[PDB]
Ligand binder design. Sequence first.
Ligand SMILES: [Mg+2]
Ligand SMILES: [Mg+2]
Ligand SMILES: [Mg+2]
Ligand SMILES: [Mg+2]
Ligand SMILES: [Mg+2]
Ligand SMILES: [Mg+2]
Ligand SMILES: [Mg+2]
Ligand SMILES: [Mg+2]
Ligand SMILES: [Mg+2]
Ligand SMILES: [Mg+2]
Ligand SMILES: [Mg+2]
Ligand SMILES: [Mg+2]
Ligand SMILES: [Mg+2]
Ligand SMILES: [Mg+2]
Ligand SMILES: [Mg+2]
Ligand SMILES: [Mg+2]
Ligand SMILES: [Mg+2]
Ligand SMILES: [Mg+2]
Ligand SMILES: [Mg+2]
Ligand SMILES: [Mg+2]
Ligand SMILES: [Mg+2]
Ligand SMILES: [Mg+2]
Ligand SMILES: [Mg+2]
Ligand SMILES: [Mg+2]
Ligand SMILES: [Mg+2]
Ligand SMILES: [Mg+2]
Ligand SMILES: [Mg+2]
Ligand SMILES: [Mg+2]
Ligand SMILES: [Mg+2]
Ligand SMILES: [Mg+2]
Ligand SMILES: [Mg+2]
Ligand SMILES: [Mg+2]
Ligand SMILES: [Mg+2]
Ligand SMILES: [Mg+2]
Lengths: 49, 59, 50
Amino acid sequence: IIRKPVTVHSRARCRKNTLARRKGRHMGIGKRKGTANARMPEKVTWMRR
Amino acid sequence: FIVDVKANKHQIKQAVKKLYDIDVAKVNTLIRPDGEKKAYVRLAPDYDALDVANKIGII
Amino acid sequence: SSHKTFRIKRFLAKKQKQNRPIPQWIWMKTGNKIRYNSKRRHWRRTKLGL
RNA sequence: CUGGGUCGGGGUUUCGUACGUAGCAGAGCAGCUGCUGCGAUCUAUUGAAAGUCAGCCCUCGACACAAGGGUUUGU
RNA sequence: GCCCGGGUGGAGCCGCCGCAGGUGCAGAUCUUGGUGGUAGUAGCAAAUAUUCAAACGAGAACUUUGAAGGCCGAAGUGGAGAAGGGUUCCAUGUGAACAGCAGUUGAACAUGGGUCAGUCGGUCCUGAGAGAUGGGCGAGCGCCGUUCCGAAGGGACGGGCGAUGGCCUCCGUUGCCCUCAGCCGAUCGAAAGGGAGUCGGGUUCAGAUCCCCGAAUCCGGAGUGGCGGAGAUGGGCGCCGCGAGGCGUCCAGUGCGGUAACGCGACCGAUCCCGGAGAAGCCGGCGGGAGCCCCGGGGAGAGUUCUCUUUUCUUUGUGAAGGGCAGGGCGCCCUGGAAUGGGUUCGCCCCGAGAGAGGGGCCCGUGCCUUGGAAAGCGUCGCGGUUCCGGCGGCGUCCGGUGAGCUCUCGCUGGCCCUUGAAAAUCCGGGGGAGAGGGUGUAAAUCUCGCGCCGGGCCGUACCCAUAUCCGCAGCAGGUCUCCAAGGUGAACAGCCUCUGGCAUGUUGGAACAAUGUAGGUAAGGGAAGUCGGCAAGCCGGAUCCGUAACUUCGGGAUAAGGAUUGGCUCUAAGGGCUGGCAGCCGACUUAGAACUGGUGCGGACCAGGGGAAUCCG
RNA sequence: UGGUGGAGGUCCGUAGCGGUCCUGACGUGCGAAUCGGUCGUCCGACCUGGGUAUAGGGGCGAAAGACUAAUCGAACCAUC
Ligand SMILES: [Mg+2]
Ligand SMILES: [Mg+2]
Ligand SMILES: [Mg+2]
Ligand SMILES: [Mg+2]
Ligand SMILES: [Mg+2]
Ligand SMILES: [Mg+2]
Ligand SMILES: [Mg+2]
Ligand SMILES: [Mg+2]
Ligand SMILES: [Mg+2]
Ligand SMILES: [Mg+2]
Ligand SMILES: [Mg+2]
Ligand SMILES: [Mg+2]
Ligand SMILES: [Mg+2]
Ligand SMILES: [Mg+2]
Ligand SMILES: [Mg+2]
Ligand SMILES: [Mg+2]
Ligand SMILES: [Mg+2]
Ligand SMILES: [Mg+2]
Ligand SMILES: [Mg+2]
Ligand SMILES: [Mg+2]
Ligand SMILES: [Mg+2]
Ligand SMILES: [Mg+2]
Ligand SMILES: [Mg+2]
Ligand SMILES: [Mg+2]
Ligand SMILES: [Mg+2]
Ligand SMILES: [Mg+2]
Ligand SMILES: [Mg+2]
Ligand SMILES: [Mg+2]
Ligand SMILES: [Mg+2]
Ligand SMILES: [Mg+2]
Ligand SMILES: [Mg+2]
Ligand SMILES: [Mg+2]
Ligand SMILES: [Mg+2]
Ligand SMILES: [Mg+2]
């Protein structure tokens, strides 16, 4: 009786895409659905400043 | 043991002590789905349960 | 229900005890007209009242 | 010594030029003192690659198969 | 209507004269029971889906195992409860009936098993309310009423009298007298309100905060209290002794420290009185702490390796209760006295009724360290019992960083109310000062301090909790109260895909692919000519940058209307922390601009407002 | 004028609650009222569990003669 290993669910793809977003890719005004305030709240910005 | 529903834990302890001249560490009682009370009687460490069961007749 | 009263549990116990079939030596007595237990209750069919 | 069937090969046709490799082609960027790496894309091999009867056309290439089975019928 | 013959049948029956009636069926959408045609017909079509091999077996599309492909997709087809069900739970066996096909299978049938508690709940409290007595009413069973037309206390510190037991000491047990004094009304009313106190590891076929192991904890009790420690042992005088230390008289001794907040291991005290906790709404913002998620590494084991990949995946810990330290908060204290006003928040807000600046005190500390505790757990490698084993061994359980991230929790602060957002049980503190102890000791009365001794009775506890255990006549697409909640995309708990976990397509399968349907789509040219009627379908749709009329109750209309852009890749610029105008080291997502590039394609799936001009009514 | 702040029986829109249109499906149905797409609302006169009170010429009703156990312009049960 063996315990079968967990089926692989890799994160390499999403972490590579995260590195691309780090560099600034895939973040054009075409690829955004929420408002500017929703994406980054101006109150939080003012708080930090 | 199987006892009737009108027996306290103290009563069960005393009855076992008198009948079987042994010592009882503790008693746990439940009521079976069929009606009668079932009692688990834990004896003193210096008494083993197997010899008492021998004396009873159940082995 | 897991929470139940003593009298409810006792009534349930009696009803459960009553649900067995007849002993096989009944039907071949002399003055016997019983073929089977006609009062058997199934939990899905009849719901015990209460 | 004939038959279809399967596979294969051509014909037609659909889409649009495959993987790999090479390029001193490439917005540029980083490292080593001109070289080496990342880089969407581009050029050549490349009207290439892939599909194409299942209800498309031809084969005379390969393979096995095909002288069967059952029920009836009379002036 | 009847008489014979034949057959079946197995125990009673008829003729004539009278007597009596529950005395004659084709119907009443007659009553009960039975049986047809319809008809081997309608139908066994809501929620994507199954395939290969083997085993068992008379028998396999449906059972079991393995493999593959799928779905649920954390607001689940997952893991647990409440109500309800009541043995449906577990094991073995059977395949007559049931599970609208079948079954080797079942929530079916037949044999047996299974629910263990001082700490989990009930049990107690009172809420909205329910309901006796007194009283009133009523022909009457009864009804009204819950403090109202009531002699509503059966209690007690202490004192006195009388009796008893125990070494009759001192106390207990009473019986009588003196003295002391309210009740908000008996009683019931919550398995989600209040309500002291149990956690970790292991174990079963089915039970675990319940059994075993190990660590705790609350309440209650104890003549002699079992014991330590506190109350406590000092000063004066006359002395002795060289002094140390030791005698004889007096006097005190119900603790001590800090300026203060307050602290220390305890630190007498009744009736009575005061107060606190229990004990409080909704919403907003922010901060702290955990759990989870995320990033960079060390291990251990797995996956890919046709080429590449220091690669991808899994795992990498400590309970309750004490002690200590971080870290949060304070409308707490002391010094000092401030305009040239200052401190400070995301916002506020604060100050001569004492700000800043120093120094302290208190509360919570669910975080970290430690005791528990490595001995156990877990991950790997290897030996055993050839097994019946909490078997035995090696190694490891490591180092870091970040986040307007999500959930929970703690705290600060504000907003809203013609809404102000429970009671009681129980517990505690204080004010008082009635009493008690001893005369210097063997100190006593008294101790909310430490340890020690004994006990905690009764009832529930299995399982389902829902496209099959509940209610709908049923395994019914209905209904039925809750907690936990991963990765990617994305504003998102939206939609879509996946991991842990689960499932077998929803009461059958095979072969065909006619009509007509039901549910989806696409259509040349026209564009509402259709129709009662643009019904239905279709257009628009996210985000960024421009622009936005009439009218208006001046708030809106408004995403009005109307335009442009959106991909991929390579860059640039700006927006910060820590340490020692600068230097070094770390860093989290954003925003803007540019170049290049693709068959003009870029909110490429998913998500996702058609618009305008008017009339009527509210 | 630029920020800040974060009101509202405010707007889009989930869960929840409800039920417009297709007069779609079904109409001896899955169902003696369900299903699908599309819809209204979604911080308040909001939704919901349990406890408790109101009983038939009575109750309760933001009022439709609505609801009062599939029964309502007078419930259900037994008797006359
Ligand atoms: Mg049922
Ligand atoms: Mg006979
Ligand atoms: Mg008669
Ligand atoms: Mg007839
Ligand atoms: Mg048919
Ligand atoms: Mg579940
Ligand atoms: Mg379960
Ligand atoms: Mg079972
Ligand atoms: Mg069947
Ligand atoms: Mg225990
Ligand atoms: Mg009354
Ligand atoms: Mg009570
Ligand atoms: Mg309770
Ligand atoms: Mg100050
Ligand atoms: Mg170990
Ligand atoms: Mg259980
Ligand atoms: Mg299907
Ligand atoms: Mg099936
Ligand atoms: Mg079903
Ligand atoms: Mg069906
Ligand atoms: Mg057309
Ligand atoms: Mg056209
Ligand atoms: Mg016309
Ligand atoms: Mg329409
Ligand atoms: Mg308008
Ligand atoms: Mg007019
Ligand atoms: Mg209106
Ligand atoms: Mg609103
Ligand atoms: Mg219709
Ligand atoms: Mg029909
Ligand atoms: Mg709205
Ligand atoms: Mg009345
Ligand atoms: Mg009317
Ligand atoms: Mg009437």
